[PDB]
């Protein structure tokens, strides 16, 4: 069959939407502003392990919280990275900006991060067995009560495609008391695109 996006199934249930504001007459403007913002962030901070972005609006200021595993790149030895960010984001938004940077602990408990790991591996021509399995073991060591992954594409350069999925632990997608994380990431290959999907069942 076809599965529902297990995040979308849980918005307004146990997860809060990431784009947080109220608006009227300003809604589309703020939305597409913040989509441009996420494009900027993903474009210039894919390397930095950026994995979640929550937006906030009040008093015209563009408040942001970037949850990342390595802060030391978003900030760090210079102190000028976040200032560059708010400068260019001022140029876009035509507003004020402020940017908190949160440290994620257990970076292998975020499906987005894990999917980027696997995707960079598969672009570097690593085996799609070892990739999935090592990501799984890293999660279950990092503290996941459940893990699941799959890859679909021209696996290994085939003509015909298929899917390879592997799971440890309890991963119930029909339960909603589940705190599940999910992600989909894309890898490029000289043969074509590979779709990596991940989802994690977490502690409490």
């Amino acid at each position: 069959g076809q599965k529902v996006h297990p995040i979308g199934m849980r918005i307004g249930v146990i997860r809060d939407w990431d784009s947080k504001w109220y608006a009227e007459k300003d809604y589309a403007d703020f939305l597409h502003e913040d989509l441009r913002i996420r494009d900027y962030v993903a474009k210039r901070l894919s390397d930095a392990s950026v994995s979640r972005v929550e937006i906030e609006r009040a008093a015209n200021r563009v408040n942001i919280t970037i949850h990342t595993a390595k802060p030391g790149m978003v900030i760090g030895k210079g102190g000028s990275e976040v200032e560059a960010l708010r400068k260019n984001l001022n140029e876009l938004t035509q507003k004020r900006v402020h940017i908190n940077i949160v440290e994620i602990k257990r970076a292998d408990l975020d499906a987005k991060l894990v999917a980027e790991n696997i995707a960079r591996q598969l672009e570097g021509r690593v085996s799609f067995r070892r990739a999935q399995k090592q990501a799984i073991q890293r999660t279950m060591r990092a503290g996941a009560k459940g893990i699941k992954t799959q890859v679909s594409g021209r696996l290994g350069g085939a003509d015909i495609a298929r899917a390879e999925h592997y799971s440890e632990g309890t991963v119930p997608l029909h339960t909603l008391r589940a705190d599940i994380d999910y992600a989909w990431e894309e890898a490029d290959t000289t043969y074509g695109k590979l779709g990596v999907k991940v989802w994690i069942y977490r502690g409490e």
Binding site: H5, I7, G8, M9, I11, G12, V13, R15, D16, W17, D18, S19, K20, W21, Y22, A23, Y27, A28, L31, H32, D34, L35, R38
Partner: protein
């Protein structure tokens, strides 16, 4: 086509009746909701992702 069409959307037409809506993400004209300004399919994506405020999945 679609890049030239997305351009021609944004510049002002000869007459104002010639306006028409397009999703800024993917400029498809059909099923674009002027309240969100998104097309239906991009809307479904982002609404799953929780990148749209206040919208969730309608049970009832």
């Amino acid at each position: 086509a679609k890049k030239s069409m997305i351009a021609k959307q944004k510049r002002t037409p000869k007459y104002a009746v010639q306006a028409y809506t397009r999703c800024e993400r993917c400029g498809r004209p059909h099923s674009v909701i002027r309240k969100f300004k998104l097309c239906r399919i991009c809307f479904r994506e982002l609404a799953y992702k929780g990148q749209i405020p206040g919208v969730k999945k309608a049970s009832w």
